[PDB]
Design a binder for this molecule. Structure first.
Ligand SMILES: Cc1nc2ccc(NC(=O)CCNC(=O)NCCc3ccc(CC(C(=O)O)C(=O)O)cc3)cc2s1
Ligand SMILES: Cc1nc2ccc(NC(=O)CCNC(=O)NCCc3ccc(CC(C(=O)O)C(=O)O)cc3)cc2s1
Ligand SMILES: Cc1nc2ccc(NC(=O)CCNC(=O)NCCc3ccc(CC(C(=O)O)C(=O)O)cc3)cc2s1
Ligand SMILES: Cc1nc2ccc(NC(=O)CCNC(=O)NCCc3ccc(CC(C(=O)O)C(=O)O)cc3)cc2s1
Lengths: 329, 330, 330, 329
């Protein structure tokens, strides 16, 4: 054999140490995949979906670029045995919202899908961290948590990580500063009831609210509330123009995967259980700033909310428990 | 204003971008090129151009929303080529794509017609640009971009066989249990059915595979290495048949070429250039041969030493491509 | 000749680089700057300059030998500033460094005399560069570079408190068990003993530490956070006492600023610039405040809302610096 | 407490997943450290030396740059407990050659130090790969292998990875081509008896020797043999000029760390046992092209050498054994 004339083998299997699985090879799952590959976060990437040809073709397309990557194994199957020994399993599967339709309207269809995905993930990686991206993300993270049986630290929702990045993009464009230097937090539900925390909005530690006490309210002459309205409407606008969103969420997810895989312990506004904070007494999930690392969410930052901000969060939390109420699974 | 209370402007500056890239076409390929380029930190400005206004604005916006996680401070788009002004590299990914069982060569009249609009508009605003053609048939379209643009040949590059050779090296690597980076091998000629695997150059750590098995790549080859080249030719149609199109691998291949041009690396790639003068080819044929790629595009060509059969195959590729070039009307 | 048998040349390029960085000084600091810049792929040419010829050639060769692992295709050095021609960024790390216990201000006459030779040579070969001063006392030396160059103030930048702030964020990170990337806090003014920690701006996730502990940064502070700023001030001294000099952190900090400059990022950094017109400063004093840094250097300053005490501490930091500064001979 | 006002702890404290240790905080050691930090290869970096102040100063100086890095933990100590659970341990400690002293004259000093270092490293990191950098590297890889009790695949000498990079640089400089596209192997000893394999030297698969049959001989009108002489003399020449070498070895070691940490299975010219190749009968370690991954060296490429190249390699082997046979430990 040519191989044996060229190479002397000194050692025969191959068990991966930093394997990530993406479930779902729609535009979101593939944006996640490419972003993860291009940040060198994994030594093995695994893809899962229910449409076989699509799945195989996406896999092969990625494999063809292997010369330009540093992830030496890309695999795919409809069978979840392909996901075994994953450190991180990202779930991007499920129905997506139509133009002009709330994410809340996807809830029952995605819960039924999760009734199938999640036990299969747990079976083959019982110690992985779950990163839920599918919408409505906050409820679907609760559902993943109940179905998996994992401790809460290891079930993370992508939440408002993207919402906050969009906020910082828009704030950046207004101020003429890079988003990395513009700080601002969008908390609560990833959707219409998200809460811009105007109190924390700042550049170089300078509170924008101190310079404009009306910041974010109807009294704001500069109308900064529209920045949050633009954050809320962003998906809707992108959906209207191109039919769907993919790139920003892929970057946003790869950002969270970077914190988890490298144990960075950066703070991200992501979905976690908030029972105990802000008078919330149920098993509700929504975005608060969390410390994220190798063990998932280890700690939560307690943001000091103004009665207005606290009210709006109360309301976000209420909207979500209102839907989560009726669920069986 | 809140901006003026927070920030004292100290400098009135109308600045031009220094490392600008434009991608023409926001189909799956064009956007794969875009995301790859942005995640490689190659550009200080990215311009996107297309003819479908909504799709264009949406793609732009989706990338912008990712800005926190990137290092490219300005992403812009328009139907109007003024948005491309002062680009260092202009990547052209627009045009019809081949159907299952259709040859890339059948795309010629449709994509030429489109290049007649795109190319003059694109070169108008960027004196310093290199032209990177990705649209198919890429070799013929690189010749066409060259003739329409009137650029010197060093500045008009076809993505060519960079992806073909990347696929070859992936498949070789899988066969040998070695990373494609350490598996060397060149597929030259047409990016298409007449490409030529250069078996004489196929090697790991400078060790020639042909020297160990002189039957390598022939029908007598017991390991049937010729099937690896077949798989290379068949790759686009296999992926098209499965997912409907290809995107990621060509995006990564184009980004690789973008990296060599933007960073003046002078690495060697198999890409489309004029080969008049080599291997007895006396006509203006564009096709892939190993080229040194840098800030001024292709500055030099590597003269590969081909066996008489490899050379006949490369001239057959050349003949095919030349015949199609004779179909062109400017 | 082998080169010519192997390669056909297409054109004679000017080879004038597009993203050249020069580091002046090949001491520990300059070399740390160099390897961080190389490893961040910021430049297409890196040029080194020093007066000790052997050391200079040795460092250049040692960097060259790793080129396979880099993406910076030309690395050059000379005592002659012809080698720095067409730099976009020139980083000056040359001069005396403080011994253990010695003050940065004690370096001033030595490093001023050195800058009398350096700065006019830099300008002759790169009249359009941004100057980044790392030598100490950095606040005074940036003024000196500024006066000597005749450059506009935007293009003469001092590394300032960029490092001091990073040290602060590290120590804060360590106390809270959070990455420094997520712990925010600003140290402004002189880069040295009179720097000012801005306690009002210290926060995680937009949540003010001073709001939770009103006595933050004072003598009353139960947790003694003042010790954190004390640690910042003492950092250089503690490292010098242990290893004889500092290099890595400042190398990283300088490359951070190089990134914002070379990639036109418009990030905000606490670096030295002329603050004439702020905080009741009427003289041409350079010290650190938050600046927007891009391809034209410092285009904007963020007006920080200082407490009366904070503003005083800075007016003091100012006064100290102008005392020495006004009376310099060049 | 302020931390507790700011942060709700949700999870009791952490074992690192991608930890690297560098033993020796000399110029080489720190070059390895900074290169590894700037390549995001580690979630934790440990330093070890025997000079307490220097050790603390270097750790501190690296920590202060943390903001600019993605390795959240940097630790040091004279005590090897600080090295626990490393996946890679890099040994850079030992005397270095004077100007005009062979690396081979360092052997008794550096074997004595390895008798302490190696059992201590292996005590605390039973899963690690050992990357030997200290000189003479080829003999010290053998030594660390016999002391450790590790299988030979997990004891790697940095060997000729640097020499080949040097070769490739010099080659590229001559041809006006980037080193990445200039191929050429220097094998055998990391020292004066290394062997340029002229037969393998090529751009784009074009053999330079085929174009110029006299390549690498005294008959060569262009004297490419002086390229290999420069490779051999590089260390000496740089030591003569700056007092020591650090950056090229640092980067060369980072390159190997990347292939190991990311299971790349790339091919490197590195120190391994060659007993049973080219007729060598003894336990000699020297550089040949090896496939390098998560289990260290899994495979060796059998380079087809010309008779003279082969003789030169056997000669390098002989030199190494003549020093090795007389070793006590
Ligand atoms: C039993 C079964 N097993 C499987 C296994 C796999 C699959 N496969 C798929 O379902 C793939 C198709 N679905 C898909 O890709 N959905 C993505 C959802 C999405 C869209 C947009 C955003 C971000 C966006 C926003 O929040 O709207 C913003 O903010 O920009 C987030 C999430 C189906 C099944 S059924
Ligand atoms: C007057 C006008 N101005 C414009 C401006 C913009 C646009 N925009 C579009 O046309 C967008 C759609 N076009 C598109 O995405 N084409 C991609 C072609 C492609 C596909 C696949 C591969 C790789 C593949 C292979 O070689 O087959 C393999 O090997 O994997 C390479 C190339 C239209 C017009 S009309
Ligand atoms: C006419 C002439 N032309 C030349 C040309 C070149 C050279 N070459 C040198 O002078 C080389 C030696 N000099 C050196 O490396 N100085 C480094 C200064 C330094 C040290 C430490 C920090 C950071 C530190 C802090 O800020 O104190 C902290 O906080 O850690 C910052 C700056 C001399 C001459 S003379
Ligand atoms: C019981 C004990 N435990 C310890 C623990 C730690 C330490 N610490 C040190 O020993 C620190 C100083 N040592 C040092 O830095 N040695 C580097 C050797 C070196 C230099 C240069 C190259 C590359 C070069 C070439 O091959 O020459 C080329 O080719 O460029 C390779 C290797 C001592 C002891 S004693």
């Amino acid at each position: 054999a040519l191989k044996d004339q060229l190479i002397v083998n000194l050692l025969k299997e191959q068990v991966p140490q930093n394997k990530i699985t993406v479930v779902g090879v729609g535009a979101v799952g593939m944006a996640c995949a490419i972003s993860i590959l291009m940040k060198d976060l994994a030594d093995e990437l695994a893809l899962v979906d229910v449409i076989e040809d699509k799945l195989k073709g996406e896999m092969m397309d990625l494999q063809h670029g292997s010369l330009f990557l540093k992830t030496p194994k890309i695999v795919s199957s409809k069978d979840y045995s392909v996901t075994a020994n994953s450190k991180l399993v990202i779930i991007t599967a499920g129905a997506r919202q139509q133009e002009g339709e709330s994410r809340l309207n996807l809830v029952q269809r995605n819960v039924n899908i999760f009734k199938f995905i999640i036990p299969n993930v747990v079976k083959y990686s019982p110690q992985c961290k779950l990163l839920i991206v599918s919408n409505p993300v906050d409820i679907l993270t609760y559902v993943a948590w109940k179905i998996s049986g994992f401790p809460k630290n290891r079930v993370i929702g992508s939440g408002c990580n993207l919402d906050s990045a969009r906020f910082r993009y828009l704030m950046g464009e207004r101020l003429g500063v890079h988003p990395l230097s513009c700080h601002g937090w969008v908390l609560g539900e990833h959707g219409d009831s998200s809460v811009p925390v105007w109190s924390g909005v700042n550049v170089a530690g300078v509170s924008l609210k101190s310079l404009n006490p009306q910041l974010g309210t109807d009294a704001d002459k500069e109308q900064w509330k529209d920045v949050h309205k633009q954050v809320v409407d962003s998906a809707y606008e992108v959906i209207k123009l191109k039919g769907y969103t993919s790139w920003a969420i892929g970057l946003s997810v790869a950002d969270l995967a970077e914190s988890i895989m490298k144990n960075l312990r950066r703070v991200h506004p992501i979905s976690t259980m908030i029972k105990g904070l802000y008078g919330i007494k149920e098993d509700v999930f929504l975005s608060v700033p969390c410390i994220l690392g190798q063990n998932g969410i280890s700690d939560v930052v307690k943001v000091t909310l103004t009665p207005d901000e606290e009210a709006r969060l109360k309301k976000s939390a209420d909207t979500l428990w209102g839907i989560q109420k009726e669920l069986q699974f």
